[PDB]
RNA sequence: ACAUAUUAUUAUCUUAUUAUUUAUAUAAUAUUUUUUAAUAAAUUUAUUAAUUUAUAUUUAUUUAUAUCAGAAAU
RNA sequence: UGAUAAGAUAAUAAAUAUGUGGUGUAAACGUGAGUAAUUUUAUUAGGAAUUAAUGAACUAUAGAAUAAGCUAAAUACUUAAUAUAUAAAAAGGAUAUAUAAUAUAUUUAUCUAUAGUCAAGCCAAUAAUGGUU
RNA sequence: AUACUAAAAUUAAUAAUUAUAGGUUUUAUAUAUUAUUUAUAA
RNA sequence: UAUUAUCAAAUUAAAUCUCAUUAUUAGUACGCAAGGACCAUAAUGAAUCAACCCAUGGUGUAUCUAUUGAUAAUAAUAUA
């Protein structure tokens, strides 16, 4: 996971990537979450970093913040990489515009 | 991880590659398409799980088969059923049927006859697959020198160390062997000596049709002392050496023949590094049967 | 957008024809 | 005084689907083909990566236009 | 038939419509929600834009049944050669003649051309309830 | 620590040991481009 | 109860003191039935209080980026 967000890694997670969070089944009864990375939040402590993701399920918009080093998630998979249209580290401004995420699971399954 | 095991893995991956769907091969074996495979997420046979990535696949070398054949265990489906599973493929696919070469028949025969001990299974398998090969447009594999001559080698091996006196059955078996042969290339190796030996052993008079009286002129092995060249030169003539060894061991009329023994001596000169495979197989068969 | 554009064009043609009729009369 | 419904309209909001548009691709598969590292036997041309290369391709669409439905309004 | 209990070939008699594939639900049955006629119905010894390469599926004649692939295999799907100037198409299933896979007949299937038949698209004229509060 | 006070840390430069503030250097954070981009070596 | 550095007792001045629901006991005791407990425990909360900033939210005239208009400056060549 450190290499996943390592600033020294060209192929790191950036705002705009759509990712899937997979939870460990033995430790919790959660379901995988597909979300659009609004922000990668890194702090002084490496273990205490988080992902802010967004997804418009049907017509209800949810955003989820996950601790990237919580032992309840095994891995996070990149479903589709970001595009160069957006021009910031944190894409908060997409909320409510034509840049907004939409139904990611439906789009992927299309 | 034995050499036979790694060869089995290689040929298994080869046959899996050829048996997988054509439209799917680009998304199973082309690393450039890994992300596309991840996105489109195909299911496995009977929808077991998503398709797994695999590396590219290159042609398969010939030695991978005979290597395991010689380095087989006393009994296992891994080699017992390999021929059946390999031939249980559509004649349409070309690689699976063109990989088999005429020089592999006498390779498979030895392991079943000596180490595995279930030679009846292989002899049984070599019946319904003849016409399948004919459709697969590769009929040259069952030739004379590597298939007919080796068949009579195995037949005489059966008759020796065991009790055999059925002249009528011997005649019928010779005739059906001639039937099974479907590629007429008569070379240095001559089966006239063998058929005469079986005839005098079992009381039956040699009878065949279309056979040629080609004199035995096995290429003499030189006095080379090289490495890879030496071992390859020995490898390309291993079989006829075994033919000559069986002839010397059994045929007492072999005195008039001189090419066989001189070729044997030259091959042994080339083989000074190891022992004689003919008596090696004799020992293996004796200890496994007793 | 385009609907407003074509609607304005239609009214423009309407009023131009009306002006032509009035001038002729 | 005023209240609640139903229907219909557009110079008006979002809008699933498809249809026409434009538009760049290790292109996604190939074809195609500079081709190039090899394969591999008893001494081979797909088979990957890539490298064609305009052919189709696709989904991004790059930009627009129509459209189920539901918002306000008259 | 492997000199041993292995896997096949060929025949007689059977099994499978939970595997691929073909045909049949553009009909018939029911109903009247819509619909007042710029897009519906009825009627003309009506018209042309002098109407698809239209056969949909049976008749009457002629002809044709081929190569690659993909599927486990095909009468499944794809790309390719002619055949009334067009880039214009297909299919095999059951005897007897032939081995120490085809050539011919009978059977039903497949494809194309020209007519028939049943059938199709679009027009004209006249008519089709009430309200001008 | 705090209105001024008061409280607390350090005032090392050594025949033996201490980092208070700034500056400096590293490792991170933020910002938003980024292999094409890095300086490199070879 | 006569120094200094440090650790500190008894005291004194205050603060605090809580209250619901649910569950078990137990549908038991009590009741023709309807209804239905005291005695106890546990859990979740309320209300008040105290502290903290690892995380989340706000700020953040530290900082970085984009942008509208006007003006001025340094560096390059060019000319004098
Ligand atoms: Mg079926
Ligand atoms: Mg109907
Ligand atoms: Mg009716
Ligand atoms: Mg045909
Ligand atoms: Mg067909
Ligand atoms: Mg000093
Ligand atoms: Mg300090
Ligand atoms: Mg300092
Ligand atoms: Mg120091
Ligand atoms: Mg004290
Ligand atoms: Mg008290
Ligand atoms: Mg108390
Ligand atoms: Mg209080
Ligand atoms: Mg904080
Ligand atoms: Mg902090
Ligand atoms: Mg925060
Ligand atoms: Mg903060």
UniProtKB/Swiss-Prot annotation, chain A:
Its main location: mitochondrion. The keyword Hydrolase does not apply. It comes from the Eukaryota. One of its GO terms (molecular function) is structural constituent of ribosome. Keywords: Mitochondrion, Ribonucleoprotein, Ribosomal protein, Transit peptide. One of its GO terms (cellular component) is mitochondrion. One of its GO terms (biological process) is mitochondrial translation. It is found in: Mitochondrion. The keyword Transit peptide applies. Present with 4150 molecules/cell in log phase SD medium. Component of the mitochondrial ribosome (mitoribosome), a dedicated translation machinery responsible for the synthesis of mitochondrial genome-encoded proteins, including at least some of the essential transmembrane subunits of the mitochondrial respiratory chain. The mitoribosomes are attached to the mitochondrial inner membrane and translation products are cotranslationally integrated into the membrane. bL19m is essential for respiration. Belongs to the bacterial ribosomal protein bL19 family. Component of the mitochondrial large ribosomal subunit (mt-LSU). Mature yeast 74S mitochondrial ribosomes consist of a small (37S) and a large (54S) subunit. The 37S small subunit contains a 15S ribosomal RNA (15S mt-rRNA) and 34 different proteins. The 54S large subunit contains a 21S rRNA (21S mt-rRNA) and 46 different proteins. This is Large ribosomal subunit protein bL19m. The chain holds residues 58 to 167 of 169 of the full protein.
From Swiss-Prot, chain B:
One of its GO terms (molecular function) is structural constituent of ribosome. This is Small ribosomal subunit protein mS27. GO terms for cellular component: mitochondrial inner membrane; mitochondrial small ribosomal subunit; mitochondrion. It comes from the Eukaryota. The keyword Zinc does not apply. The keyword Mitochondrion applies. It comes from Saccharomyces cerevisiae (strain ATCC 204508 / S288c). Belongs to the mitochondrion-specific ribosomal protein mS27 family. GO terms for biological process: mitochondrial translation. Keywords: Mitochondrion, Ribonucleoprotein, Ribosomal protein, Transit peptide. Its main location: mitochondrion. Component of the mitochondrial small ribosomal subunit (mt-SSU). Mature yeast 74S mitochondrial ribosomes consist of a small (37S) and a large (54S) subunit. The 37S small subunit contains a 15S ribosomal RNA (15S mt-rRNA) and 34 different proteins. The 54S large subunit contains a 21S rRNA (21S mt-rRNA) and 46 different proteins. Component of the mitochondrial ribosome (mitoribosome), a dedicated translation machinery responsible for the synthesis of mitochondrial genome-encoded proteins, including at least some of the essential transmembrane subunits of the mitochondrial respiratory chain. The mitoribosomes are attached to the mitochondrial inner membrane and translation products are cotranslationally integrated into the membrane. It is found in: Mitochondrion.
UniProtKB/Swiss-Prot annotation, chain C:
The precursor is processed in two steps involving mitochondrial intermediate peptidase (MIP) and mitochondrial processing peptidase (MPP). It comes from the Eukaryota. It is found in: Mitochondrion. Present with 6960 molecules/cell in log phase SD medium. Belongs to the universal ribosomal protein uS15 family. Component of the mitochondrial small ribosomal subunit (mt-SSU). Mature yeast 74S mitochondrial ribosomes consist of a small (37S) and a large (54S) subunit. The 37S small subunit contains a 15S ribosomal RNA (15S mt-rRNA) and 34 different proteins. The 54S large subunit contains a 21S rRNA (21S mt-rRNA) and 46 different proteins. Component of the mitochondrial ribosome (mitoribosome), a dedicated translation machinery responsible for the synthesis of mitochondrial genome-encoded proteins, including at least some of the essential transmembrane subunits of the mitochondrial respiratory chain. The mitoribosomes are attached to the mitochondrial inner membrane and translation products are cotranslationally integrated into the membrane. This is Small ribosomal subunit protein uS15m. It comes from Saccharomyces cerevisiae (strain ATCC 204508 / S288c).
């Amino acid at each position: 996971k450190r290499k996943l967000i390592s600033k020294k890694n060209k192929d790191r997670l950036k705002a705009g990537d759509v990712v899937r969070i997979v939870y460990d089944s033995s430790k919790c009864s959660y379901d995988t979450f597909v979300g659009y990375i609004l922000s990668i939040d890194r702090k002084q402590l490496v273990q205490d970093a988080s992902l802010l993701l967004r997804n418009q399920i049907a017509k209800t918009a949810v955003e989820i913040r996950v601790p990237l080093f919580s032992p309840l998630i095994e891995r996070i998979d990149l479903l589709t990489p970001h595009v160069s249209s957006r021009q910031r580290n944190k894409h908060y401004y997409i909320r409510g515009t034509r840049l907004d995420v939409g139904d990611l699971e439906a789009g992927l399954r299309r | 991880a034995s050499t036979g095991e790694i060869a089995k893995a290689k040929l298994d991956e080869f046959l899996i590659y050829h048996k997988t769907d054509a439209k799917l091969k680009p998304f199973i074996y082309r690393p450039k398409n890994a992300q596309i495979l991840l996105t489109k997420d195909i299911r496995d046979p009977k929808t077991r799980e998503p398709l797994q990535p695999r590396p590219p696949v290159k042609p398969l070398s010939k030695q991978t088969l005979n290597d395991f054949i010689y380095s087989v265990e006393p009994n296992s489906t891994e080699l017992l059923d390999w021929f059946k599973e390999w031939t249980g493929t559509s004649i349409r696919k070309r690689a699976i049927w063109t990989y088999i070469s005429p020089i592999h028949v006498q390779k498979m025969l030895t392991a079943s006859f000596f180490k595995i001990g279930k030679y009846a299974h292989m002899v049984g398998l070599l019946y319904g697959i003849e016409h399948k090969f004919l459709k697969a447009q590769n009929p040259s594999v069952f030739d004379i020198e590597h298939f007919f001559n080796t068949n009579i080698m195995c037949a005489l091996h059966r008759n020796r160390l065991k009790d055999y006196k059925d002249a009528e059955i011997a005649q019928r078996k010779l005739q059906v062997a001639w039937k099974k042969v479907l590629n007429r290339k008569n070379n240095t190796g001559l089966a006239n000596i063998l058929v005469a030996t079986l005839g005098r052993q079992i009381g039956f008079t040699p009878e065949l049709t279309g056979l040629q009286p080609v004199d035995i002129s096995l290429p003499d092995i030189p006095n080379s002392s090289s490495g890879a060249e030496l071992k390859d030169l020995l490898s390309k003539y291993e079989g006829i050496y075994l033919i000559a060894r069986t002839l010397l061991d059994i045929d007492q009329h072999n005195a008039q023949y001189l090419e066989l023994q001189e070729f044997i001596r030259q091959y042994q000169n080339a083989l000074s590094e190891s022992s004689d495979p003919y008596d090696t197989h004799l020992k293996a068969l004796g200890l496994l049967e007793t | 957008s385009a609907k407003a554009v074509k609607f304005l064009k239609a009214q423009r043609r309407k009023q131009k024809n009306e002006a032509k009729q009035a001038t002729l009369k």
